[PDB]
Coordinates of C-alpha atoms and ligand atoms in Angstrom, one line a residue:
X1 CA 0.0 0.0 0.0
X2 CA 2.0 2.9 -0.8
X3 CA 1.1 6.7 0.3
X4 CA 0.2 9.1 -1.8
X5 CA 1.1 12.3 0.3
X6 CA 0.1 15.7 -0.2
X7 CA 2.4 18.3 2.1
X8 CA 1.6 21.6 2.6
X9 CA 3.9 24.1 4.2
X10 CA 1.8 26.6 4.6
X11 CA 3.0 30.7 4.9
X12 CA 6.0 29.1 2.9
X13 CA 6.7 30.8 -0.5
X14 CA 9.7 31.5 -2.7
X15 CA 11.5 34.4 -3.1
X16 CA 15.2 35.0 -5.0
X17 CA 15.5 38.0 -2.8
X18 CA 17.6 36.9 0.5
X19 CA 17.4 40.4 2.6
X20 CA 13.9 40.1 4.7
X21 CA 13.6 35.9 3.4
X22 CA 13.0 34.1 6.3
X23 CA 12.6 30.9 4.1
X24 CA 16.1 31.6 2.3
X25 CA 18.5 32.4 5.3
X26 CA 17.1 29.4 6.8
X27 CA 19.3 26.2 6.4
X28 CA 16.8 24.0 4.8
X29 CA 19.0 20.6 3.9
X30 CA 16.0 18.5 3.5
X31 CA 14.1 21.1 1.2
X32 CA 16.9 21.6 -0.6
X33 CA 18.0 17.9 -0.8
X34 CA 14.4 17.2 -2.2
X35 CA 14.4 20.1 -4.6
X36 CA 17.8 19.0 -5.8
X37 CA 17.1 15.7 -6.8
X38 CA 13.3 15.0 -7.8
X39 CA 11.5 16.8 -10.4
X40 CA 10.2 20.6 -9.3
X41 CA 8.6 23.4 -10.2
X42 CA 6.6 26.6 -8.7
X43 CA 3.0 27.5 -8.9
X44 CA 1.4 30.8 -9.0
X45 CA -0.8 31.0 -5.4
X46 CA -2.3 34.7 -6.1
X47 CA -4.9 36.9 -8.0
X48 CA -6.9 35.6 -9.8
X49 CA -4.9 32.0 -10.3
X50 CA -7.0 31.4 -7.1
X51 CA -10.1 33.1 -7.4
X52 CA -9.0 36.5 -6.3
X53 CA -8.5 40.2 -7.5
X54 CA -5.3 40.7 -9.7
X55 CA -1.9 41.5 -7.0
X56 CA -3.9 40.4 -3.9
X57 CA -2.1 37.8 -2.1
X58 CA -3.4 33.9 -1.3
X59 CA -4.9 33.0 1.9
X60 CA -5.0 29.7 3.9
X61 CA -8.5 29.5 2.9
X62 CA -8.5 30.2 -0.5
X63 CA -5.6 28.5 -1.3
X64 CA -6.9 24.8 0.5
X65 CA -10.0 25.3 -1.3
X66 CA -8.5 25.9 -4.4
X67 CA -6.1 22.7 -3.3
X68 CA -8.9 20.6 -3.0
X69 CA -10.9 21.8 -5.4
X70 CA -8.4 20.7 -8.4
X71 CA -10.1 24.0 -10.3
X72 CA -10.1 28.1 -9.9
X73 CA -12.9 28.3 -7.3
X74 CA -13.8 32.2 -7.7
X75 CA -15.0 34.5 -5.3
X76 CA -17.8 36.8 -6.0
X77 CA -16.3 40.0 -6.4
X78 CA -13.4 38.7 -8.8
X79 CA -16.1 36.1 -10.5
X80 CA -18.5 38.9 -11.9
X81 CA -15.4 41.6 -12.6
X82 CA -13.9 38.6 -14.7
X83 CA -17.2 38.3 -16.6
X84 CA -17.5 42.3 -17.0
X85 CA -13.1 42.3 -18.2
X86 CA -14.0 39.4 -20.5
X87 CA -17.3 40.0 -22.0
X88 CA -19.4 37.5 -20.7
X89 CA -21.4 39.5 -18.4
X90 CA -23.8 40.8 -21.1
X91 CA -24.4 37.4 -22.7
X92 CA -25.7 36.4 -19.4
X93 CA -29.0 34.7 -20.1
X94 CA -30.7 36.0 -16.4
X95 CA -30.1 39.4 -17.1
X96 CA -31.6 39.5 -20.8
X97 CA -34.4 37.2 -19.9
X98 CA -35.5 40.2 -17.4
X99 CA -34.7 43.2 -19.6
X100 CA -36.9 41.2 -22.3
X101 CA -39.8 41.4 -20.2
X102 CA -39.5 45.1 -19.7
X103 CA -39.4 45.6 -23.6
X104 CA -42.7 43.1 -24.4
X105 CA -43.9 44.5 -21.1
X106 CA -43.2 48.3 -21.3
X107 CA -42.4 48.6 -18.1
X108 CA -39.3 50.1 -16.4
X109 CA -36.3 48.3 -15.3
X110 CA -34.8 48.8 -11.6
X111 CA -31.4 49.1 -10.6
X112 CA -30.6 49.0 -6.6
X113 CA -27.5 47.7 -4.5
X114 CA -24.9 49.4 -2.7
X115 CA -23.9 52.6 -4.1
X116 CA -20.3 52.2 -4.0
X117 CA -16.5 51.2 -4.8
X118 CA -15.9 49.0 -1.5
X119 CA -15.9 45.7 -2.8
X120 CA -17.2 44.2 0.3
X121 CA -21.0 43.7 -0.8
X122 CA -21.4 45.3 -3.9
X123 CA -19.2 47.5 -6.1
X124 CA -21.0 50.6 -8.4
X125 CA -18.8 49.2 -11.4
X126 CA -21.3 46.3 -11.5
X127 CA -24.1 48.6 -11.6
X128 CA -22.4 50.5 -14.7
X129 CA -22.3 47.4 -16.5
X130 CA -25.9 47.3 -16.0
X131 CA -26.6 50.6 -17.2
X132 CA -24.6 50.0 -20.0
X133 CA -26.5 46.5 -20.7
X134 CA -29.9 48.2 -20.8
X135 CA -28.6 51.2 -22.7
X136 CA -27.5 48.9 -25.5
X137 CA -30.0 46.5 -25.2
X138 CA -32.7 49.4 -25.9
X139 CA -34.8 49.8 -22.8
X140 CA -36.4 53.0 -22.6
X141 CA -36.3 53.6 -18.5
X142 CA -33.8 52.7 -15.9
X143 CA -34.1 53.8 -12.5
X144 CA -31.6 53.5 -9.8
X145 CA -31.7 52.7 -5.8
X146 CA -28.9 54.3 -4.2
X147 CA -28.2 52.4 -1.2
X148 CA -25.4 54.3 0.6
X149 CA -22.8 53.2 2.3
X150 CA -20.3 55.4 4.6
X151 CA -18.7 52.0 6.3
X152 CA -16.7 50.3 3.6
X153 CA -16.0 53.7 2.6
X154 CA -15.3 56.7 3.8
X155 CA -18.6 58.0 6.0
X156 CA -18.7 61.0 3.4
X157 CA -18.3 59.7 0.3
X158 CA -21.7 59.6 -1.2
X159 CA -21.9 62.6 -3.5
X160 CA -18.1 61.6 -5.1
X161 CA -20.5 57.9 -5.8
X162 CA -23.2 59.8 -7.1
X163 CA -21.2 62.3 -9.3
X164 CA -19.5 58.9 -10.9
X165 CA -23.1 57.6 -11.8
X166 CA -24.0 60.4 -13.2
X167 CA -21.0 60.5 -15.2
X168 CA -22.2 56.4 -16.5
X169 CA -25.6 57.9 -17.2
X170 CA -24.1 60.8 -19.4
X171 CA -22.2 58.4 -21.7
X172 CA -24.7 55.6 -21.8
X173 CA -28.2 57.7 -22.2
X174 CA -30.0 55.9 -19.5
X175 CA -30.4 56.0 -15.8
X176 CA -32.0 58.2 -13.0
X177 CA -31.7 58.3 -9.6
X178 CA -35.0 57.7 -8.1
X179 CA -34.6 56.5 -4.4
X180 CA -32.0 56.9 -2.1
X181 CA -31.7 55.3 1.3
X182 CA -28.9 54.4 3.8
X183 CA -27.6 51.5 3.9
X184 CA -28.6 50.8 7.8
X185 CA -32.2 51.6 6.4
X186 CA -31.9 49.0 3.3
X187 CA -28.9 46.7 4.8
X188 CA -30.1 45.6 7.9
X189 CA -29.1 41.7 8.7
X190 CA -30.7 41.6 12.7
X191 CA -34.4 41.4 11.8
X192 CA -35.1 45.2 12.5
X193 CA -38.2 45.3 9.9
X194 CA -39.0 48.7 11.1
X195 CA -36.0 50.2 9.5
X196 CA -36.6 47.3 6.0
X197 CA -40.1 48.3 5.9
X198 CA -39.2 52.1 5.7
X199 CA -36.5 52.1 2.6
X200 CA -39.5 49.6 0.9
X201 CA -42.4 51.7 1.6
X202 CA -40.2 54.6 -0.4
X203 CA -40.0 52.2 -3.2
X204 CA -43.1 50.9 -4.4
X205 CA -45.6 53.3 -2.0
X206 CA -43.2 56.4 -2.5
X207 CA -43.7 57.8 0.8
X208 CA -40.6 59.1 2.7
X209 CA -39.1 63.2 2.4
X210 CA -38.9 64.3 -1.1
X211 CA -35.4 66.2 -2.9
X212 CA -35.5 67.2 -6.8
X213 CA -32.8 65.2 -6.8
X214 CA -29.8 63.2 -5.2
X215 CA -27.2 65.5 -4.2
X216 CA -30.3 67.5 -3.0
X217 CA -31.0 64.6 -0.6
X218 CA -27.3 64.2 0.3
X219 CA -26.4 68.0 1.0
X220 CA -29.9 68.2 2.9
X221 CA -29.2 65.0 4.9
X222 CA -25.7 66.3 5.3
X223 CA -26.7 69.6 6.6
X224 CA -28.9 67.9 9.4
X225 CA -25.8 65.8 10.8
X226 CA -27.1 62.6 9.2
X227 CA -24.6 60.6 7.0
X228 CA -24.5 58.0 4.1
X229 CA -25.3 55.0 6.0
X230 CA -28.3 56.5 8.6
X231 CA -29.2 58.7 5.4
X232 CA -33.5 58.5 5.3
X233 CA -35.0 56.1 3.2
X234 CA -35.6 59.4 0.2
X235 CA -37.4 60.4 -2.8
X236 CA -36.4 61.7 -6.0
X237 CA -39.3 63.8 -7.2
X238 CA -39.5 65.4 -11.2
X239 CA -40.3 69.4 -11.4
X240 CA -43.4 68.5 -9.8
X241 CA -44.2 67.0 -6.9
X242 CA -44.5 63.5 -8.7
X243 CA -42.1 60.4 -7.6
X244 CA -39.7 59.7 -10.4
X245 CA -40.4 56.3 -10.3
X246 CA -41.9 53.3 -8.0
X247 CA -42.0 49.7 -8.6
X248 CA -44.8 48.8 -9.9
X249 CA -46.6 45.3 -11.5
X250 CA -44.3 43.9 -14.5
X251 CA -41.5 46.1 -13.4
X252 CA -38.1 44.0 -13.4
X253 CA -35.3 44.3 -10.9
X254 CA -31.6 43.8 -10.6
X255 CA -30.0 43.7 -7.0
X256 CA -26.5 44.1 -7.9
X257 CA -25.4 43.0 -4.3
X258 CA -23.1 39.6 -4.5
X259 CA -23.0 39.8 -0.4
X260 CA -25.8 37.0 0.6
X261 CA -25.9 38.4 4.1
X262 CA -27.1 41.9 4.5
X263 CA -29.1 41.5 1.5
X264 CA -31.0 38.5 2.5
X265 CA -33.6 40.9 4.1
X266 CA -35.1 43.2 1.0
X267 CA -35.0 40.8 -1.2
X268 CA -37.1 38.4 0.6
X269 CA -39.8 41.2 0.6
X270 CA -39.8 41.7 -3.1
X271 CA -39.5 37.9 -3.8
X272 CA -41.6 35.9 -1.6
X273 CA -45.4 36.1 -2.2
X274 CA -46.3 35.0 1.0
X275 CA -43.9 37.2 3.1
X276 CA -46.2 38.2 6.1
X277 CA -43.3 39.7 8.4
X278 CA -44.5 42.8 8.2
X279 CA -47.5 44.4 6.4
X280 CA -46.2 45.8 3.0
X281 CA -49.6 47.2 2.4
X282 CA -52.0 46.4 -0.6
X283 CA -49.8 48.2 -3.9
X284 CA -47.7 44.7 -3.9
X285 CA -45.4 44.7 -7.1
X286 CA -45.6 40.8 -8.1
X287 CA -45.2 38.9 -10.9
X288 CA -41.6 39.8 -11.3
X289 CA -38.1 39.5 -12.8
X290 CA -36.3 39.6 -9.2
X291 CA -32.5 39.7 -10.0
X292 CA -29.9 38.9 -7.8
X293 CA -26.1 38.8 -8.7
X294 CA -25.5 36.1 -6.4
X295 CA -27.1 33.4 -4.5
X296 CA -28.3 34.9 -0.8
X297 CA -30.2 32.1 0.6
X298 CA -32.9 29.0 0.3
X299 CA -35.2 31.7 1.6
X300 CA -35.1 33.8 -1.5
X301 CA -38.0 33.2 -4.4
X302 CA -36.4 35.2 -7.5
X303 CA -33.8 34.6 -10.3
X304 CA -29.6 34.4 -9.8
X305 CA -27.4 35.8 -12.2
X306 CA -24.2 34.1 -10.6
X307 CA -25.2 30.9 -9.5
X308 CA -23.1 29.2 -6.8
X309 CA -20.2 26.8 -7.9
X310 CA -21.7 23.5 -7.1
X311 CA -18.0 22.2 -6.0
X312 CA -19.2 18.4 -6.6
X313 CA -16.0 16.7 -7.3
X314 CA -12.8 17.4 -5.1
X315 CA -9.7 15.6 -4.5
X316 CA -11.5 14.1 -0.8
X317 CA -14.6 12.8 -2.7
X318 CA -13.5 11.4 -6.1
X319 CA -10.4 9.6 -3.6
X320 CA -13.6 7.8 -2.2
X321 CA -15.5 7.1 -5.0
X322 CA -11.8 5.0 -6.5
X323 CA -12.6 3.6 -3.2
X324 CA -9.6 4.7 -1.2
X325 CA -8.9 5.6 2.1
X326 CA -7.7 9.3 2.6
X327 CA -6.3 11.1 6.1
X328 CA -6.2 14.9 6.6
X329 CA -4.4 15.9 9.7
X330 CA -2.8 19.1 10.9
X331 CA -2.5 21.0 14.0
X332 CA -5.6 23.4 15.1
X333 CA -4.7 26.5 13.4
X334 CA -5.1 25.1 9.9
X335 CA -7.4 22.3 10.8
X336 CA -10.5 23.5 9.1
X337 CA -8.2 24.0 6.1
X338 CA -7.0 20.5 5.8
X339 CA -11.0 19.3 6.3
X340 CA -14.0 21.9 5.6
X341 CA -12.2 24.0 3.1
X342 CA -10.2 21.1 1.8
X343 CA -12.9 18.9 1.1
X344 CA -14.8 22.4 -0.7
X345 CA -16.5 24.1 2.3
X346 CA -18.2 20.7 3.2
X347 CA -18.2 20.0 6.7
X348 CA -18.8 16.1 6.7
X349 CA -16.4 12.9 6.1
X350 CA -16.2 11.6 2.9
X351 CA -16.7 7.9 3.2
X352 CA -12.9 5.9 4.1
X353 CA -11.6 9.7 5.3
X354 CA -10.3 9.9 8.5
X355 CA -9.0 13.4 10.2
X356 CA -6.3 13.6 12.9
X357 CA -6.3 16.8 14.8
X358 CA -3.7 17.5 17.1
X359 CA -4.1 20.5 19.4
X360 CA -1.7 23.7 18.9
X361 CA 0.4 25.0 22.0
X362 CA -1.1 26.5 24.5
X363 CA 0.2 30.1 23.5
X364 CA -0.4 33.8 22.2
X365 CA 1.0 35.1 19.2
X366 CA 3.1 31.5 18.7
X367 CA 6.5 33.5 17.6
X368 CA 7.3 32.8 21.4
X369 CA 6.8 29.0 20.4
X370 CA 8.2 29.0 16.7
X371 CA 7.9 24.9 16.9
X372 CA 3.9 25.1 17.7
X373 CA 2.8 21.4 17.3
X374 CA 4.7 20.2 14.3
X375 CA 6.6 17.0 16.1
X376 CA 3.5 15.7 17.7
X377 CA 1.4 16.3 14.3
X378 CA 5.6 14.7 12.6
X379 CA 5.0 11.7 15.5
X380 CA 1.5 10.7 14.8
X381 CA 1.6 10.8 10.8
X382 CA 4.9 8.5 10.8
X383 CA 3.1 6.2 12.9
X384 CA 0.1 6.1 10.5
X385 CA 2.6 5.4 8.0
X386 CA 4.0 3.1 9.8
X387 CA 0.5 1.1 10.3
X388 CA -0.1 1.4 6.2
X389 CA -3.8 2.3 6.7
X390 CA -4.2 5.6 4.2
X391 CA -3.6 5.5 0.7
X392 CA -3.9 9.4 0.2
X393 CA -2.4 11.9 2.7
X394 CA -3.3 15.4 3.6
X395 CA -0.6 16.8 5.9
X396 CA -0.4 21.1 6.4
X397 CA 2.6 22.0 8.3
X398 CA 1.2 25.7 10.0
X399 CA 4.6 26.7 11.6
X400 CA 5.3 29.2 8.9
X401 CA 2.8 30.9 8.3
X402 CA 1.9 31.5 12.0
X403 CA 5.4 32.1 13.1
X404 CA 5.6 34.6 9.9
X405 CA 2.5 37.1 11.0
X406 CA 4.9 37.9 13.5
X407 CA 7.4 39.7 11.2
X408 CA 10.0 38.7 13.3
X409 CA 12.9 36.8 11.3
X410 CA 14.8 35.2 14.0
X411 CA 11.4 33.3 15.5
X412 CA 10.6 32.7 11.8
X413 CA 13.8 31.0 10.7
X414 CA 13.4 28.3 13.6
X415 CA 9.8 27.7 12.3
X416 CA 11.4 27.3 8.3
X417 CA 14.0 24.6 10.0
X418 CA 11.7 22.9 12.4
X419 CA 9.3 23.0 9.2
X420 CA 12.5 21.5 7.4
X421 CA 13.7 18.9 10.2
X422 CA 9.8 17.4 10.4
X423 CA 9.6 17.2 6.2
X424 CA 12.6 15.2 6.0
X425 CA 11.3 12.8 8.8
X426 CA 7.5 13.0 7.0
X427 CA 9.1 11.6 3.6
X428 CA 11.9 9.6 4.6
X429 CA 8.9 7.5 5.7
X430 CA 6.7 8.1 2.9
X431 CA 9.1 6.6 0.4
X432 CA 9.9 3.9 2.7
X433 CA 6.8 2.8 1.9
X434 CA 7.3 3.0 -2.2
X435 CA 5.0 6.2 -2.1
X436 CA 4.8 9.5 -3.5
X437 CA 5.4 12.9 -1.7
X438 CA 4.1 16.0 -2.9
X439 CA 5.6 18.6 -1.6
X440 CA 3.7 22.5 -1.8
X441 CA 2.9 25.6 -0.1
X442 CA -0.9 27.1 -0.2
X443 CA 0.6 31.0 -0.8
X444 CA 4.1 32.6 0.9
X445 CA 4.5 34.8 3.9
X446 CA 7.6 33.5 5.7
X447 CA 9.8 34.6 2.5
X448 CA 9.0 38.2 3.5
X449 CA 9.3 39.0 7.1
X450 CA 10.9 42.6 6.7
X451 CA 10.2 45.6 4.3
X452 CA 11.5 48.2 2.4
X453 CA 12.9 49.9 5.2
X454 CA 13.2 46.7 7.9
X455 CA 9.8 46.8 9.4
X456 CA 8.0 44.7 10.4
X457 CA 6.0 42.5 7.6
X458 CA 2.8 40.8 9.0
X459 CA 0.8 39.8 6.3
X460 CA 1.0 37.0 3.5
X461 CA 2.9 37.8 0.0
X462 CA 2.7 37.3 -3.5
X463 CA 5.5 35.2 -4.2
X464 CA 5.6 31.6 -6.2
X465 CA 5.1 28.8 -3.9
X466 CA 7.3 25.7 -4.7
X467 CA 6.5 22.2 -5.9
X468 CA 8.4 18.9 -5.8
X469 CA 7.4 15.4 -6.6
X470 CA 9.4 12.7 -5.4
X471 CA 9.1 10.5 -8.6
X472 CA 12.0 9.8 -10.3
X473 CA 11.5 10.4 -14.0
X474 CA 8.4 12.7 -14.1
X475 CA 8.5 16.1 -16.4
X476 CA 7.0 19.1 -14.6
X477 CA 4.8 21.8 -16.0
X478 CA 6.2 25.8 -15.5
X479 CA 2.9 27.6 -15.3
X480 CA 1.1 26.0 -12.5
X481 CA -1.3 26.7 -10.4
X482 CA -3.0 25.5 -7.6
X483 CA -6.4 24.0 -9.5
X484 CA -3.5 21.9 -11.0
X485 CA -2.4 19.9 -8.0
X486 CA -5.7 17.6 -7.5
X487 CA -5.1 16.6 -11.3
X488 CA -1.5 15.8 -11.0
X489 CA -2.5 13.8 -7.7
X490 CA -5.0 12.0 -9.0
X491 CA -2.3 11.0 -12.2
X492 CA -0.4 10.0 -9.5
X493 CA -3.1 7.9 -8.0
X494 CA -3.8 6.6 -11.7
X495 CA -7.7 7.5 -10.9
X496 CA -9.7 9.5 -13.9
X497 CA -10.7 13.2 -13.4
X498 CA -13.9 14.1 -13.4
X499 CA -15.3 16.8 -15.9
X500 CA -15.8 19.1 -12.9
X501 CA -12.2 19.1 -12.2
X502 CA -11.0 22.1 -14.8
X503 CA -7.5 22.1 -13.5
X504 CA -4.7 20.0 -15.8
X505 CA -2.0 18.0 -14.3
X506 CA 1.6 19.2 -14.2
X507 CA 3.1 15.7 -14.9
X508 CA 4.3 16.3 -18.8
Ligands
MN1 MN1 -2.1 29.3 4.5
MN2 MN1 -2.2 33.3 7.5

């Protein structure tokens, strides 16, 4: 029975620059011994390689989902901005289904979300996009719902938001401000209906203070000390008294909003039917085309434009379908990342997996304790390897990266050669038993533990993480990324990969 181990490092990347490497001006004999003599290569852990903006660095959870997940497993924000960059957005058969209706129907379409660049549950972009979908598309009225925010930005920022869409409404011919509220009125996650029922009853009822238009709202709201995210749910009103637009029957909506959480509670009011948390009245707009970018919950009725990646087949599950028996094990800090984001956020054991956890040192910051738990965690897989009852291994090594948020390079070289010293001992007994090590990081940290200047560095980096099998005559790809490793293990494992599985193997 020979072991088929995956090793990750973790906070270990790989840098040519020696000042500030914790990872190079450590005396790694084993690494280097391994790297010297079986087949290697690195693999691109960051941006969008791993489902992320383009510079942003890799993170522990990320990068053991995108392990697993032997594909790019995209995050919201970085999933829709791709399909805006690459022109796919627009084709997007959700969207046009609901802006057909408007045309056939003669109705308006609605545009609401979070009226901002702060990434964190919308961004204004993807509202521009839409604007510029409709305005090509040839629909004749597009109203917007400014939802302000003032917490993932600035707390006076609004107007500089508002100024920009106006700008997008200039260039594309369509759009008008029609409602504004605060995002504590419209993003409300505790169950506070009060405030929910107030930004709604300006929507489709129209009832609320009235401006002539946006900014009016803002410098009026302004000038009576409330900001951007307490700002009244508001109406936009023409020359006349008359409310620029409600939603009314037939009317289609977008919520740009890719955040499931603080968005869960409007949307359930528009999309339900049989709602009944609080009275919304007898002017009910139903019958609808109820966008939302992304999926927010079961409890939502309307359509998604960015369905949820299904994640079916990961390295864990299709491992137990070939019938083998597979062992994650790490110490606690990256225990969830050798299970639940491993295995594709998926809390249960795969049939023949069995997880090891061993507890991490009873300690603060763990610079103090560079060694953590890595000989216990050493100890206990050796002796599993010793007993020959897994055929697939999932070992993370945390030392690393938890002894390299410190940004302290003397702790952090003792965690790179107690890393080093328990590798050598994990793989001397892996190809004792005529198996196959391979050897990775999940993104790099260690490798930069000073700055510019020499302070300290706390965070993740960007670097290259490395890549070794310890296979004699195997060719090794140069791209590489991490949706590549499942692939190349399950080549290992002579096992097929599953259609779901988009990552290719690096064995040439
Ligand atoms: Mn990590
Ligand atoms: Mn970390």
């Amino acid at each position: 029975r020979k072991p088929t181990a995956l090793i990750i490092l973790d906070g270990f990347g790989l840098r040519e620059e020696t000042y500030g490497n914790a990872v190079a001006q450590a005396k790694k004999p084993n690494f280097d011994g391994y790297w010297n003599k079986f087949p290697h290569t690195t693999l691109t852990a960051c941006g969008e390689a791993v489902g992320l903006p383009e510079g942003q660095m890799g993170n522990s959870e990320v990068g053991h989902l995108n392990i697993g997940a032997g594909r790019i497993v995209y995050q919201s924000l970085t999933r829709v901005n791709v399909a805006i960059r690459e022109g796919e957005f627009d084709k997007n058969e959700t969207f046009q289904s609901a802006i057909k209706s408007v045309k056939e129907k003669g109705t308006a379409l609605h545009l609401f979300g979070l009226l901002s660049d702060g990434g964190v549950h919308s961004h204004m972009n993807h509202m521009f996009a839409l604007l510029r979908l409709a305005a090509k598309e040839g629909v004749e009225k597009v109203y917007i719902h400014a939802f302000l925010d003032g917490r993932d930005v600035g707390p006076k920022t609004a107007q500089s938001y508002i100024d920009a869409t106006n700008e997008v409404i200039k260039e594309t011919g369509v759009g008008q401000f029609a409602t504004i509220s605060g995002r504590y009125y419209s993003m409300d996650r505790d169950k506070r209906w009060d405030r929910v029922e107030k930004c709604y009853r300006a929507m489709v009822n129209g009832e609320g203070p009235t401006y002539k238009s946006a900014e009016e709202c803002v410098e009026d709201s302004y000038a009576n000390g409330i900001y951007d995210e307490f700002v009244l749910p508001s109406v936009i009103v023409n020359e006349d008294n008359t409310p620029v637009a409600t939603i009314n029957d037939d009317d289609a909506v977008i919520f740009y909003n890719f955040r499931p959480d603080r968005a869960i509670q409007i949307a359930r009011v528009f999309t339900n039917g049989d709602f009944r948390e609080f009275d919304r009245g007898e002017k009910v707009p139903h019958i609808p085309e109820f966008v939302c970018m992304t999926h927010f919950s079961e409890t939502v009725d309307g359509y998604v434009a960015f369905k949820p990646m299904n994640l079916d087949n990961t390295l864990g599950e299709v491992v137990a379908q070939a019938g083998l028996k597979q062992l994650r094990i790490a110490e606690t800090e990256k225990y969830p990342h050798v299970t639940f984001f491993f295995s594709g956020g998926r809390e249960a054991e795969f049939p023949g997996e069995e997880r090891i956890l061993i507890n991490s040192p009873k300690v603060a910051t763990y610079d103090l304790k560079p060694e953590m738990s890595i000989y216990e965690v050493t100890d206990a897989l050796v002796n599993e390897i010793e007993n020959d009852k897994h055929d697939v291994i999932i070992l993370n090594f945390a030392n690393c990266d938890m002894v390299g948020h410190s940004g302290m390079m003397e702790p952090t070289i003792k965690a790179v050669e107690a890393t080093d010293e328990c590798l050598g001992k994990v793989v001397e007994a892996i190809l004792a038993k005529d198996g196959v090590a391979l050897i990775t990081a999940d993104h790099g940290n260690a490798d930069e533990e000073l700055t510019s200047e020499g302070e300290p560095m706390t965070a993740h980096t960007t670097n290259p993480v490395p890549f070794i099998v310890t296979k004699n005559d195997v060719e090794l790809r140069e791209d590489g990324i991490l949706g590549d490793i499942a692939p190349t293990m399950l080549t290992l494992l002579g096992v097929e990969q599953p259609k779901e599985m988009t990552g290719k193997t690096i064995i040439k």
